[PDB]
Symmetry: C2
Subunit: 125 residues, 2 copies
């Protein structure tokens, strides 16, 4: 859907920005600094699950650019594993949110964050 | 969810970028320049419906900035009407996509685009 590689870069940066807001806005909740409303979090995690499926299709071959490392492309199977593993961490977060289980939410949130940090150290300049 | 007004600006710009890609990538399909796969479009419009609910909460009071006109805030009921009417145009697009009805898709797509253009002329610098 991208006329030029720059358009893919702009898309994925935007998707990642949104994905980061939907994740990070729950930090006060997980820490107990903000109240836990199970319905609120269930709805937010549904938004996060949609967003978390979006960036990866905008790292197609030849879309080198932005803050992305060139290792994203040469090691296609491995980058894929990190994005697929991140989404299966998101599936666990959804399950926790759907259950309205704060303790399960906190644990799943920590796992998701670790997956963010890993892919970052690895595939972000 | 925004530490400073700039963070709201960045969020809404990103949401609007995503929303624009999910809408505009269907243009070749509506024009017949690309094939119509009803399942593909149904899934894409589901993504667009999620995205189309996101920008508006990032125009909260005091988040003046970006390319947004100051009329977004002083006329809160009217801006609201344009975003609510845009989303009800998206509901009609979803219905068309869910029905797998190309003619209904084209008509709904045109209505959505007109709603984009209107709010733009009005509330974008
Ligand atoms: C790889 C499988 C990643 C996972 C999982 C996550 N991110 Fe990441 N992120 C990744 C790359 C390769 C890039 C650079 C994209 C580019 O072309 O520039 C990024 C970027 C971000 C950004 C900055 C976006 C921008 O506006 O430019 C943020 C804020 C970000 N990523 C956050 C983030 C969070 C919180 C994640 C988990 C919820 C996460 N990312 C996962 C690669 C990957
Ligand atoms: C008001 C109710 C709007 C509707 C409906 C749509 N858009 Fe819009 N858009 C609007 C504003 C006020 C702004 C400026 C935001 C800012 O603070 O800068 C925008 C911006 C865009 C952008 C640019 C985003 C960026 O990266 O900076 C695009 C590409 C865009 N809008 C597209 C667009 C499309 C295609 C729409 C319908 C599917 C649409 N917008 C609706 C206000 C409103």
């Amino acid at each position: 859907q991208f006329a030029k590689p720059e358009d893919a870069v702009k898309y994925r940066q935007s998707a990642l920005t949104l994905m980061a807001s939907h994740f990070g806005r729950m930090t006060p909740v997980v820490k107990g600094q903000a109240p836990y409303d199970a319905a609120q979090i269930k709805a937010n995690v549904e938004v996060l699950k949609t967003l978390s499926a979006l960036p990866w299709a905008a790292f197609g071959p030849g879309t080198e650019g932005g803050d992305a490392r060139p290792e994203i492309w040469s090691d296609a199977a491995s980058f894929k594993q990190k994005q697929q593993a991140f989404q299966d961490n998101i599936v666990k977060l959804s399950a926790a949110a759907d259950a309205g289980d704060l303790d399960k939410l906190r644990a799943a949130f920590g796992d998701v964050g670790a997956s963010c940090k890993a892919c970052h150290q690895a595939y972000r300049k």
